[PDB]
Amino acid sequence: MKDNTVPLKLIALLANGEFHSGEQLGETLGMSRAAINKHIQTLRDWGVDVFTVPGKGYSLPEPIQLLNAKQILGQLDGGSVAVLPVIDSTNQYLLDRIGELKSGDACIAEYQQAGSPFGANLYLSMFWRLEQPAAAIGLSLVIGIVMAEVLRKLGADKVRVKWPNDLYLQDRKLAGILVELTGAAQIVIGAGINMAMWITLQEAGINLDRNTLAAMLIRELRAALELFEQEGLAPYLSRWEKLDNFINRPVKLIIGDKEIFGISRGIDKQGALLLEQDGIIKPWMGGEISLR
């Protein structure tokens, strides 16, 4: 894989949001001001905002945070966790290593070359092997709960879930989850949170430490999945209820070509959407919910 140490090392230098000159950078990095100039371009290539001013140098319109493996692993117990601020995709990374992983192994990033600028979002993926493809929708629901739960704990109180895989805030999307199965069912979960700049944590006054958020999520996700793996959904049913962004609200459910109108009533014990239409209530196992 490509080596991005310098740019990173560099972005780290500039991170404080102040001004720094090539001379300045060069000596700390031990290299020509010509090189620096070269690495600045990269940053630029990653969506990073690095302003330049003649008799002044370079700086960032805003100080920032960077994943820091140390910190993260410092607050975790066991299991591999690959912290790669820069990567193609968190999911593929895992996908490609299906044979060397274990349930719980993870991968974290703040920029995906594959696909959104460096640091705007938090990416996380985790691997898990269920004893039996018995979950899925179940699974996705659990992931939203936890994540919503975790965010709340750090203070983003109005975070809610959107069946069956998004997180919402003020009726806008803040995060998305994805689940992928592999032909013992091998799964790779992935999620992306909108940290900073559809809505974002910053956008709404919340300013979390990303390393801690990463830490908790992994911890928490790992706990929840093993709970899932043996009790299924039962233990979340009530939790889902308190978080449902749309429960008892009129929604529109697009299922294929079909645009179906109704009132959300939550989910069933199987994680199915309960849609009530004209005094009738039925469970739907797929579709895209939207506000109507």
Q: Which residues are annotated as a binding site for biotin?
A: 89-91, 112, 173
In the sheet with 250-255, reading across from the earlier edge strand, the strands are 280-284, 273-277, 258-267, 250-255, 288-291
At 129, which helix (H) or strand (E)? strand 121-130
Pairwise CA distance, residues 86 & 10, whole Å: 14
At 276, which helix (H) or strand (E)? strand 273-277
**H helices, E strands: number in the chain:** 8, 14
Residue tagged 């990653």 (tokens): 46
Residue tagged 């020509």 (tokens): 32
Per the annotation, binding residues are: 89-91, 112, 173
At 90, which helix (H) or strand (E)? helix 90-95
Query: Pick from 120, 151, 144, 139: which is nearest to 214 by CA?
Result: 151
Adjacent-strand bridge partners of 19: none
